[PDB]
Symmetry: D2
Subunit: 237 residues, 4 copies
């Protein structure tokens, strides 16, 4: 059973699992049923930016999702990630389709993590940046339908050769090195992740959306987690 | 009159102007009467570390002051820095003594400021790092009694040739370049400052403390701001 | 008399002052007559990129200029910058027009400088990044005709309200803080500079070019330095 | 067998395999017999620093090793690394002892790699920093005798419970994620690595050394590569 903390850009309302009745961003703590959601005006066909941030002083996980010249969507949840996640994790991106579909393309992805210890306050840091993805991206672990290199992008779910998306798809990309997201003797620890994404659907109704996630290091796509489950969770609980 | 936002490490309780009964860290918004303080166990003669952080999403100014192997002191305050400070600022370190005294020695200082715009989501960033100060530190604006180069440290208040700190001293170092801490169309702005310091006193009661501050670009040490005013405020209101 | 080190992007061959017969890049060490040049196929109207890098171990100043999908032009020169520059400098961008003309438009600028001392191996660093410029960009020093804000770009030379570049123009933007590009007791000092540019001319022959430069902190545009002099040298010697 | 590019800090003169007559640093291109060496006055028991850098414009691999207040040892070799190494590598630290011995203690390790592609000039970056190592350091592959966490240091070779270095020991630490050190379509690609070390020995002649290396990703310690082989090479050819 994986341990998942995620920020979801949820394009499709599943009101039967507590989704609000509109597209929304959310913070997910070991459940697809979001602890905090905000309305998000997803723009079919457009490049947007997501920013996710946390530090161990405020213990507050926050995300802003944005398109140029539009009002941002913002969401925040108070949570001690020390109590939720293991000491070492992987970080990734996840996306799915179900009966409705959309391209879940990633154009760029960056991440930064820093830990200062309570004994002689030495800082350990990790930073990665992808502004292009190649056919053979050896520092990503690609799971399920995820592919890299088409146009120099990361396509999290299946795209057919004519460029339209497919339903019932799920895939994820995880950064290869494990990440130390907390330590018991840290003065401050923090992270920030940003990615740019392009969600396009020929349907009237896109689905199912994209997530930034932090998981146990050995995490994999739960069985049957296409659709509303976003590649993250084994069920809707 | 200057506009001051500061994180104070207040070594001396002036209860007649609202200080708690004990050395305390605090967040100062345009006043020396902090908006929020927490108890701080200052350690005479030991090198400690301070970290200050803010971002435009949570709008929450937060600091942690620490010594190796001790419990941290932590303090936070909800505040929209957009509403308080001008678009352009200087960032700086400040310290004073009064009728009681201490060294106000800075061994390192770093600062990172980031803004991503709402118009195609381009990032502007400033970073500086001092892990040693030379006698001619041209990218530091030194005010009052502040000097650089002695042992490679920044001494914010006057220290005599024999190492002894002097009373009635006030001194400040501001980074040379102005800094853009907000813009009306930034999706996320954030900053982070760190410094190491060494407060030592031959007195029973050290005074008066060290502050990291953000100010209008033309800020200078207000008149008679030695002692309890920490080099920051013209008065005690 | 100023002391300039510079990387020139020279759009206009002035063979009377030792320019080669074609648009070219070059390294200039206290003279507009380049110590080294290489052929540069400038592309009228196209967004280009330049990179300048140097380190105190190799003592080699090297620059690459390129457009997406073209062969890069590269040039390098063996010079000990400690021998040439004062210890504190400013960094900047300069451009000019003369009887012929072009827009000298800067769309992004970044610079990182790092010094490690011979005792006790402590690093000082400076980093800045401009991915957009605003109307009042207080951390740039503008000289001559240079302005910021139109479209979020830095226009180093005069452009008219209608978009047309003007003859006989010259301007520079220097970053506000002086920079420590060297110190006597350094294990290693280095820097890198990147900028993107857009040179468009309605003339059959574009003039005069853009340079990245490093100078005495108190550099100004030498008088009459339009055209072939590039905002940089008082004469063609 | 493996493809290795290394910077050796070589404490023991093995004159039978072309080592010079004195402790030295060298650049190793697929052979233990360095393509260039410089004289290194290793200091028994004192914390040193090494810096290695390379960029694809100069195609010069260079290194500096120093102690506070000493003259530096520096060595360089003109080598085009995309000609030698595969497109994907891992970076690491290696060390060995044989009949004679020393502690190979790593106190800190940082690394930054960067690639700008020839289309659309997009940057890919990796950065890691260890200023402490814990007992369970999941983002390092440890091979052979290497251990982490004792005093927060990485011990590349065996040390017994009482601090005493052991003979016939070989160990390495690789960063976990693969690193993209060249791309055929790259404007400029570069890296820099820094480590701090403490080499301490009871022997009249300390042995054998520490290396920074870059290898095929699936590299392991070659068979019998203790002593003069430095845990890097299967033989001394
Ligand atoms: C009333 C709320 N609502 C709309 C928001 C809704 C409800 C039912 C369907 C809906 C939508 O859509 C479809 C669409 C299709 N197709 C695409 C046009 C053909 C493939 C077919 C059927 C329906 C059905 C459907 C009809 C009858 C029987 C079963 C289903 C069904 O979805 O059953 C599967 C599991 O659902 C069980 C009950 O769930 C009721 C909630 N409902 C169901 C859905 C669609 O859900 C699927 O698609 C979603 C979008 O990709 C994913 O998030 C889900 O993981 C996936 O199961 N949305 N809301
Ligand atoms: C060499 C001189 N020396 C150092 C040993 C010294 C001298 C005088 C005092 C000293 C110390 O201490 C105190 C302390 C207190 N209290 C301790 C918390 C509270 C009972 C009180 C009086 C003295 C006084 C004092 C007594 C009588 C008359 C005036 C003062 C006085 O402080 O004159 C100058 C301004 O004082 C006006 C009245 O202030 C009431 C607050 N009181 C006074 C002080 C000392 O304050 C001075 O020193 C502080 C510490 O550096 C600074 O923060 C202040 O800005 C600075 O003005 N602290 N609390
Ligand atoms: C390129 C076309 N050409 C060559 C046929 C040419 C063009 C202009 C002049 C020219 C020649 O010559 C003179 C000569 C004189 N005198 C004779 C020596 C004085 C009696 C006076 C004016 C002009 C001028 C002149 C007259 C009126 C206004 C301006 C100029 C001029 O800029 O002139 C700059 C001086 O050029 C002299 C010869 O140089 C040959 C190189 N070539 C290139 C240019 C254009 O030069 C200007 O424009 C260039 C491109 O922007 C800049 O790089 C230069 O720095 C700037 O001086 N001019 N010639
Ligand atoms: C430095 C002092 N020296 C020269 C006087 C010397 C030291 C040891 C031997 C030496 C010589 O010679 C031999 C010779 C043999 N034989 C005949 C060739 C076989 C019967 C056997 C053992 C020893 C050994 C030996 C004895 C006991 C345990 C190990 C060894 C050994 O490693 O020995 C490696 C011997 O290499 C042959 C001679 O090499 C001359 C160089 N000399 C030998 C060494 C020891 O080298 C070991 O230690 C070095 C330092 O750690 C490492 O760089 C080497 O990788 C590691 O093999 N260093 N310098
Ligand atoms: Ca949903
Ligand atoms: Ca006080
Ligand atoms: Ca020219
Ligand atoms: Ca050797
Ligand atoms: Mn949801
Ligand atoms: Mn106070
Ligand atoms: Mn030229
Ligand atoms: Mn050797």
């Amino acid at each position: 059973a994986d341990t998942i903390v995620a920020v979801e850009l949820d394009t499709y309302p599943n009101t039967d699992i507590g989704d609000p009745s509109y597209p929304h961003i959310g913070i997910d703590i070991k459940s697809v049923r979001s602890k905090k959601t905000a309305k998000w005006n997803m723009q079919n066909g457009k490049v947007g930016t997501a920013h996710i941030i946390y530090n161990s002083v405020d213990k507050r996980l926050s995300a802003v999702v944005s398109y140029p010249n539009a009002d941002s969507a913002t969401v925040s949840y108070d949570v001690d990630l020390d109590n939720v996640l293991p000491e070492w994790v992987r970080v990734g991106l996840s996306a799915s389709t179900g009966l409705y579909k959309e391209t879940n393309t990633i154009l760029s992805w960056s991440f930064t993590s820093k830990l200062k210890s309570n004994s002689t306050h030495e800082t350990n840091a990790l930073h990665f940046m992808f502004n292009q993805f190649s056919k053979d991206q050896k520092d990503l672990i690609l799971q399920g339908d995820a592919t890299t290199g088409t146009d120099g992008n990361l396509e999290l779910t299946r795209v057919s050769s004519n460029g339209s998306p497919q339903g019932s798809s799920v895939g994820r990309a995880l950064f290869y090195a494990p990440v130390h997201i907390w330590e018991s003797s840290a003065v401050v620890a923090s992270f920030e992740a940003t990615f740019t994404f392009l969600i396009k659907s020929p349907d009237s109704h896109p689905a199912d959306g994209i997530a930034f996630f932090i998981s146990n290091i050995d995490s994999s796509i739960p069985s049957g987690s296409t659709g509303r489950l976003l590649g993250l969770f084994p069920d809707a609980n």
